[PDB]
Design a protein around this ligand. Structure first.
Ligand code: J4V
Ligand code: MG
Ligand code: MG
Ligand code: MG
Ligand code: MG
Ligand code: ZN
Length: 889
């Protein structure tokens, strides 16, 4: 296993100036001819010329049109092509090759492959070497001249990067298209697509240069009616980058293409963005609400890459977070502006603190710029993406919008057209910091520790108020636990956005304030504070940390009801829930351990339940926010706080708490479920795909959340409401009716009904699979076996496999069955998937990430399955590497 180290970066001894490709797609094979116009760099030391080339069948290779001979002048081992240095020219030369590849049987979906009837590439990170020989690293920038030929009937639409400069007929029913893309790019941004594609199009006129840009969105013919929202989102994305960042698209055309088989969400190939169909296609009849926010975010994300990743690219793969963290941050700003709902920010926090915090306290923990890797296919993590985004967002918090924009422009103007590193961005932000602070001695050197230090900081507080002096102090401490990456952790630059709430009237007592904590601890003092305040801490979730607010539940309730910041209200509620959860968990655990015949549980705080009722009944309060306060914290958030977590005890704990609150609020829940119906399910714009109302979708989220709570509670005659809900035109509603019917003998009647509604749309059927997989059923294992035999079968579509199995792994009681049979089942699926798609097999490992946090029996069960997978003779590099790190070997 070759380990690559960040510290070892060195420029290549070679240069590739021009790539000229001919890609000839045939029935049983694709022939790729490539001419590379090359040179010797100032770094050359007479080394052999080594190309990346994986799984290529060589027809011939030449230098300066002289055919090379295998053995004598080169060797190829199916991974590297080595040309012995004595045969490498000492000035500009042409390297040429012709190889054969087989997209039809490329089920790993990397390189050039076939998805249904579409030929499509995926080159990030090191997939270009699966198409032709190359020095496959992002600092090898070159111009591309690409010709694609193919059967015209099967593949009428041909696309690649750049301008289409020729189209031509070929004998025997074939045709070709030539694309020239003069700006330099790294090879991971190369793309080609061939297929019988249908489209929608529009023209966008840029804000300042007034350039006309052609926008095309493509899919297979069957789903062309699902393209409209994506096109609207693309327009919105272009406008936002123009309006917030002053950035305009500078190419003549941008193509978005949906394919059914894709390892991730989408890919920002220059001028030719390629999408998982589930992240591009939607219609109100055939998609759940979540698709609309998903398409907005993924279209936005790929568009924002045009500057942050494409025009400014990466020196090397260790800089990944420079394009991904920064582009997620740009997409978050975009989606917050487009949706205008507080739940947008809250949902990104929720994701970070459950999934990313779990990663950062697991054996997989890494900084957002790792020091090493074995597999790039495993490198695209929530740490790099989501913690990266929070680190990119902290610059905006620290600088404020005016100076952040100044700093961002410096970054773009200094690095446009080049490779860049994380230091380049920090440098640009630093220039703005000096300006904001009005002194050139100010620096952000400490800030760089956010790129290198792993683990989640813990921030805790003590307060003091002098009533005579009208003086309030906030004493703050930070602490990162030592881990495998750093024995000694250093204090970070932590920005703490704060407010001070007057508890008598709920009003703000100070102006907007961001505390700059740069030491292990500091005390922040405020004068002229007329009454003891309740502090509103880390407003907007201003740093990616464990917050320990040291507030009473009474104080947290006051914030939940009256604070101005959505995150702090949501966090205060979260903290009340966590205090209850840990208390009840320990009470149940002790009863279990001691085999007690009787015992007591601490009830849920009554004033807390009253506060939930208060907010729920407030007609001017936000529906999405309301759905968060009636939901307990995510299991994967909770597990970061409990050692040797007994999943059964936690399930019992959650049930007790929900039942406590429902016993008080169920009539309120029901009343709201009924009163919300008219607005939530309004059909006025059902046949307008341009019209998307995120408040209305949040109202449906609330109804569907309440319906779930009422169903579990077996609220009187709630099955009537369930049956009626199943007749709604909105899939979010009728799929909810399936999952909440789990608690009734009508489940399989609804199973069949919703199957019939879903089966004729590929993406809708995937949503139906997810709904079944996640169903709270005692017979869920039998149900899963039925899905396998009747629907999934031997599909190699990652969306199908992920839909059937991942939601089930969140079934706290059943996936974690003490027999270990859920662990055994997912490990079988992982091993089976690893035969043809190692990247997706490793994604299917996600349930095991928390293995060493569970009770010792479940730890042992999970470890046994992971060691079983590790012992498979045919295990991929991806899966082996991942499982070795995860099991601490
Ligand atoms: O950043 C990206 N597009 O701009 C893109 N990432 C994603 O789509 C992520 C984003 C959006 C999603 C939710 C979550 C996981 C998935 C889907 C974060 C992406 C693209 C290519 C790859 C990628 C890397 C490989 F090494 C590889 F072999 C491959 F096939 C794809 C991984 C992530
Ligand atoms: Mg091959
Ligand atoms: Mg405009
Ligand atoms: Mg299919
Ligand atoms: Mg380890
Ligand atoms: Zn990205």
């Amino acid at each position: 296993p070759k380990i690559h180290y960040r510290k070892d970066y060195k420029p290549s001894g070679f240069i590739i100036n021009q790539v000229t490709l001919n890609i000839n797609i045939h029935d049983q094979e694709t022939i790729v001819r490539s001419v590379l116009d090359m040179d010797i760099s100032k770094h050359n030391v007479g080394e052999d010329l080594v190309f990346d080339g994986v799984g290529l069948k060589i027809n011939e290779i030449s230098i300066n049109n002289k055919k090379l001979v295998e053995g004598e002048e080169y060797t190829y081992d199916n991974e590297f092509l080595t040309i012995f240095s004595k045969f490498v020219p000492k000035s500009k030369f042409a390297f040429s090759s012709e190889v054969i590849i087989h997209p039809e049987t490329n089920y790993a979906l990397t390189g050039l492959y076939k998805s249904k009837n579409i030929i499509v590439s995926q080159c990030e990170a090191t997939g270009f070497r699966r198409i032709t020989f190359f020095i496959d690293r992002p600092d090898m920038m070159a111009k591309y001249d690409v010709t694609v030929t193919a059967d015209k009937e099967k593949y009428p639409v041909l696309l690649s990067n750049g301008d289409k400069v020729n189209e031509f007929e070929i004998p025997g029913g074939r045709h070709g298209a030539r694309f020239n893309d003069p700006p330099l790019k790294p090879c991971y941004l190369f793309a080609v697509v061939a297929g019988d594609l249908k489209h929608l199009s529009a023209t966008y006129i840029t804000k300042y240069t007034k350039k006309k840009v052609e926008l095309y969105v493509f899919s297979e013919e069957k789903y062309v009616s699902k393209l409209q929202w994506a096109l609207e989102c693309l327009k919105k994305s272009m406008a936002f980058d123009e309006d917030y960042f002053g950035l305009e698209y500078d190419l003549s055309r941008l193509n978005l293409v949906a394919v059914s088989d894709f390892n991730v969400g989408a890919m920002e190939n220059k001028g030719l963005n390629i999408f998982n169909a589930n992240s591009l296609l939607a219609s109100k009849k055939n998609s759940i609400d979540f698709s609309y926010a998903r398409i907005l975010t993924v279209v936005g994300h790929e568009y924002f890459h045009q500057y942050t990743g494409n025009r400014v690219t990466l020196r090397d793969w260790f800089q990944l977070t420079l394009k991904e963290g920064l582009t997620v941050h740009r997409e978050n700003l975009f989606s917050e502006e487009m949706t205008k709902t507080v739940t947008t920010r809250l949902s990104h926090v929720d994701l970070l603190r459950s999934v990313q915090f779990l990663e950062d306290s697991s054996p997989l923990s890494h900084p957002i710029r790792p020091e090493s890797y074995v597999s790039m296919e495993n490198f695209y993590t929530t740490t790099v993406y989501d913690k990266g985004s929070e680190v990119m967002r902290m610059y905006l918090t620290i600088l404020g919008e005016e100076y952040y924009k100044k700093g961002f422009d410096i970054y773009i103007k200094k690095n446009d057209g080049n490779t860049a590193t994380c230091e380049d961005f920090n440098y640009a932000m630093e220039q703005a910091y000096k300006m904001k602070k009005a002194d050139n001695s100010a620096n952000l050197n400490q800030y760089l520790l956010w790129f290198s230090q792993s683990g989640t900081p813990h921030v805790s507080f003590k307060y003091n108020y002098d009533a005579e002096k009208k003086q309030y102090s906030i004493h703050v401490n930070q602490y990162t636990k030592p881990d495998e990456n750093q024995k000694e952790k250093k204090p970070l630059f932590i920005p703490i956005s704060v407010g001070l709430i007057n508890p008598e009237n709920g009003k703000e007592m100070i102006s907007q304030t961001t505390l700059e904590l740069t030491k292990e601890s500091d005390t922040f003092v405020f004068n002229n504070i007329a009454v003891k305040p309740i502090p509103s801490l880390f407003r907007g979730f201003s740093a990616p940390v464990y917050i320990e607010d040291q507030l009473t539940d009474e104080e947290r309730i006051l914030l939940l009801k009256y604070d101005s910041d959505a995150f702090v209200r949501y966090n205060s509620c979260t903290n009340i829930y966590m205090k209850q959860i840990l208390m009840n968990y320990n009470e149940f655990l002790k009863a279990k351990n001691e085999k007690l015949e009787s015992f007591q549980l601490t009830p849920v705080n009554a004033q807390f339940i009253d506060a939930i009722k208060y907010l729920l009944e407030d007609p001017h309060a936000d529906a999405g926010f309301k759905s968060y306060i009636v939901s307990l914290p995510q299991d994967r958030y909770i597990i970061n706080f409990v050692s040797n977590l007994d999943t059964d005890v936690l399930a019992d704990t959650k049930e007790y708490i929900y039942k406590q609150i429902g016993d008080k609020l169920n009539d309120v829940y029901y009343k709201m479920f009924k009163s919300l119906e008219a607005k939530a399910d309004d059909l006025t714009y059902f046949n307008d795909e341009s019209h998307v109302d995120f408040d209305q979708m949040n109202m449906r989220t609330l109804r569907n959340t309440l319906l779930s709570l009422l169903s579990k509670a077996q609220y009187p005659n709630i099955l009537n409401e369930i049956i009626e809900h199943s007749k709604s035109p909105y899939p979010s509603n009728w799929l909810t009716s399936l999952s909440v019917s789990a608690y009734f003998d009508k489940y399989f009647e609804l199973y069949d009904k919703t199957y019939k509604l879903s089966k004729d749309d590929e993406l809708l059927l995937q949503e139906w699979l997810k709904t079944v997989s996640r169903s709270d059923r005692k017979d869920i294992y039998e149900i899963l076996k039925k899905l396998e035999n009747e629907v999934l079968k031997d599909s190699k579509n990652p969306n199908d496999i992920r839909a059937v199995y991942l939601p089930f792994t969140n079934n706290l009681r059943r996936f974690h069955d003490i027999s270990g049979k859920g662990y055994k089942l997912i490990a079988e699926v992982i091993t089976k998937t690893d035969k043809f798609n190692p990247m997706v097999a490793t994604q299917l490992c996600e349930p095991f990430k928390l293995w060493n946090k569970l009770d010792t029996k479940r730890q042992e069960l999970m470890l046994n399955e992971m060691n079983t997978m590790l012992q498979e003779p045919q295990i991929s590099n991806n899966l082996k590497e991942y499982l070795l790190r995860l099991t601490n070997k």
